[PDB]
Design a protein around this ligand. Structure first.
Ligand code: NA
Lengths: 494, 481
């Protein structure tokens, strides 16, 4: 009977594949065939019977076999615009670890803030969420991660518990970067789609702008961040030695030497890449996106990462009778996480197979017959629906689905069409459970410290915190701003 | 005095001095990302996977394609087949299955010096039918320098004969299958697009006209390579015996590997052209959904599931992503974004009418110039680089001179794989050059004699037995006027 115990994750794979086969065979519709794929692929990284990148190739195997989408179309989703930003930023992250730009930022910050385990997991949440309201969510988690990984590395190495304090700064960065993106419109991509859709569906309204979006979400994002900091720190880890452990940090700073030539070039290109992401289209000032304002939406944040990320292959670093560049590409293929680029692309082919089948439209059509309900319960069914569907799909894919559904739903029962749209837009970007749903969650699995069950157990509590603040906010301190109780005049009559 | 040291820093800035793109509107901008990428591919001023990301950078900057559209062309159906084939290539040499069927085609033939280098030339030509010719050249070459060491221990001339017969026979065997190399998979990807109504190019009909084409070449290359170099027996047949008795009986991890290698080879033929209908009639309502590359992912993903030891699978992901070439996935995918960048810009319509004065010579003369040009050009550049730049040039030329598009592209996707000279041409003969033998002059004399017999079979092929298979004089319903 002991042979079952050692092969417990091989018999499990052939079980759930065969026992769920009555679902797409008895039922013949393509919604029941995409639901079989969404039940098999999703439970293969929850229980983790297989590695995470093998199950991401399973969308590209049974979606052509069921007749949902061809093999040419399911293969064009494993490399999207996320991977051009992902490639061009780990050409920067490679050339700061080789020339050791970190350990000169981590051995300078630790001897300025002190070796405190409790007040350094708040400086990584309050500075990330301030940096995230100007940049994107992906480009913020890609910069502050190789520096804050070196900070927790040096404090552990200055001991002359370590496995559980590395899961904090991985999770406090993936969560604070998406929490700080709720504050402004141009802070994330989900808030920009809602701003474009509301200004054309309801013209002559004129309320949503910079500053008006801030003062109803900045009190909402500050309570979530201060409650996530208590919840994340308690779940993982709830001066005769301090004087000795503060001298190892100073002594390791002396053997570095002066700052060389090859660290200033990476420090300069760390700034120009950050001063071009911020100055692209900041909304309240025109930027260099108004120079290309004849082919709009062509040059994105991924061409900025490739413009400076490919300059590390050119700049000379050390003479040899050739020269040597900064990154040389031989130690780039060993530094690039090639398992994340398949795992993220596997979640993109599943969000494109649900749209082609109709399973995303099937769930959204069940929300429209809820007209015989109170005005607060129709939010509560809708707000937990978008948080569930955003764990398998991307955030710009869920908001374009539900905005043409909730807009005729917010006109038949004479309710204001911002009392439903606002608590469904903020809860769209509450992707905390799976790393296939959020690109800030995928620059956190590229370090090998967290498991999948450590994100589900620690991200399920942040969703209850995140929903209960917006549900509190939709009744207090937002209803005097946009007047969410009376039916407005920029809406249809009947 | 120091301008020779920083050699390709001052050479890399040719994005400045030939800049005649601010004068013209749109087609001079697309033919600026075609000439910068080409001179960086021919001269190799960059790591050769960096230049594939330059069409991802300066195509949206000019205003030709959006960044969401140029990014989707970096992952075709070729890459799902590339992942599934190098799941077999890991499990073949991790469990030493490649050392067993190489000491079996040796000692079944004799130890004669002219029969030894025919068993080596036919072993790697059969392994290259299914694997990529780069991957199977990295397996037989560690064995081919262990058999020849024990032969002479029972000199320098017979060493380099074995050095270049391994590299040349895998390149000959890299064709006869669409999934045998990356050059054949680029063309069939480019031919299923841009001519979608044509259904005449599959795995079955590719085997019929090109397997005679590589049986004349492989038999008259072994004769030619023997002529250039040359022309106690119980100890040679005993020193080979002890290594085959050093590896014990066939294990469980080697029986399973060659079962999943035969079944994957028994498929890709059971899509079954016009003789029989195969399992492409099982999925009848969806005609082109389950393609040639969803079988490589079906078999190749079973290696991570089948138990091997104590559990641990047949292969792990750690030894997969340290084994798969990610340089090829960016270089091939970076050429598809450039080939689809000269279709949304009208560059391959301006070349598709300026070569109308070329459409006055007879049809056999258009082939011989355009096949000797790409054969002379594939000796200095890599094989997915020369087939990338010429496919949006030859196929607009074919549609304007009233010739079949299969009449030019079939003898030009085979002649571009004839990289037999100096070793920067292809990693088939760059693996064997890393050893201390086969000086660069000895690859010219051994490469020129096999490149003449290479293009003489293709020029004899497309006039005798290929015309009754594709009807190359009868300009078709597709490729419209
Ligand atoms: Na943000």
């Amino acid at each position: 009977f002991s042979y079952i115990l050692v092969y417990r994750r091989f018999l499990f794979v052939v079980f759930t594949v065969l026992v769920l086969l009555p679902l797409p065979i008895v039922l013949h519709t393509k919604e029941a065939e995409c639901a079989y794929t969404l039940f098999v692929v999703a439970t293969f990284w929850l229980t983790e019977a297989l590695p995470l990148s093998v199950t991401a190739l399973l969308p590209s195997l049974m979606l052509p076999m069921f007749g949902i989408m061809p093999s040419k179309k399911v293969a064009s989703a494993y490399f999207k615009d996320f991977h051009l930003l992902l490639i061009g930023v780990i050409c920067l992250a490679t050339s700061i670890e080789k020339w050791n730009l970190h350990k000169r930022i981590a051995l300078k910050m630790v001897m300025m803030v002190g070796v405190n385990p409790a007040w350094l997991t708040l400086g990584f949440m309050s500075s990330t969420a301030f940096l995230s309201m100007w940049l994107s969510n992906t480009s913020t988690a890609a910069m502050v991660m190789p520096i804050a990984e070196a900070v927790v590395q040096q404090i552990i190495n200055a001991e002359a518990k370590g496995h559980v304090t590395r899961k904090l700064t991985c999770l406090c960065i993936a969560y604070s970067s998406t929490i700080g993106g709720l504050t402004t419109i141009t802070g994330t991509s989900t808030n920009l789609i809602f701003a474009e859709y509301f200004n054309t569906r309801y013209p002559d309204c004129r309320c949503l702008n910079f500053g008006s979006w801030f003062t109803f979400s900045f009190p909402a994002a500050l309570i979530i961040l201060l409650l996530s900091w208590i919840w994340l720190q308690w779940l993982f880890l709830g001066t005769v030695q301090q004087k000795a452990c503060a001298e190892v940090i100073k002594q390791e700073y002396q053997k570095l030497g002066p700052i060389r030539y090859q660290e200033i070039v990476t420090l300069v290109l760390f700034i120009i890449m950050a001063l071009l992401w911020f100055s692209r289209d900041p909304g309240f000032v025109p930027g260099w996106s108004a120079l290309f304002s004849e082919y709009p939406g062509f040059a994105t944040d991924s061409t900025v990462a490739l413009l400076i990320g490919l300059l590390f292959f050119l700049i000379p670093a050390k003479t040899l009778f050739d020269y040597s560049p900064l990154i040389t590409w031989k130690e780039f293929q060993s530094f690039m996480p090639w398992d994340i680029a398949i795992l993220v692309g596997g979640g993109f082919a599943l969000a494109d197979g649900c749209e082609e089948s109709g399973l995303s439209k099937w769930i959204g059509n069940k929300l429209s017959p809820l007209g015989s309900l109170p005005a607060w319960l129709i939010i509560l069914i809708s707000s937990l629906m978008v948080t569930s569907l955003t764990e398998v799909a991307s955030n710009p894919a869920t908001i374009t689905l539900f905005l043409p559904i909730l807009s005729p739903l917010a006109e038949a029962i004479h309710v204001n069409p911002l009392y439903i749209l606002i608590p469904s837009t903020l809860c769209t970007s509450f992707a905390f459970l799976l790393p296939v749903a959020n690109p800030p969650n995928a620059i956190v699995f590229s370090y090998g410290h967290l498991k999948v069950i450590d994100m589900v157990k620690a991200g399920l509590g942040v969703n209850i915190v995140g929903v209960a603040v917006v549900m509190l906010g939709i009744c207090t301190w937002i209803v005097p701003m946009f007047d969410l109780y009376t039916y407005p005049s920029w809406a249809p009559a009947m």
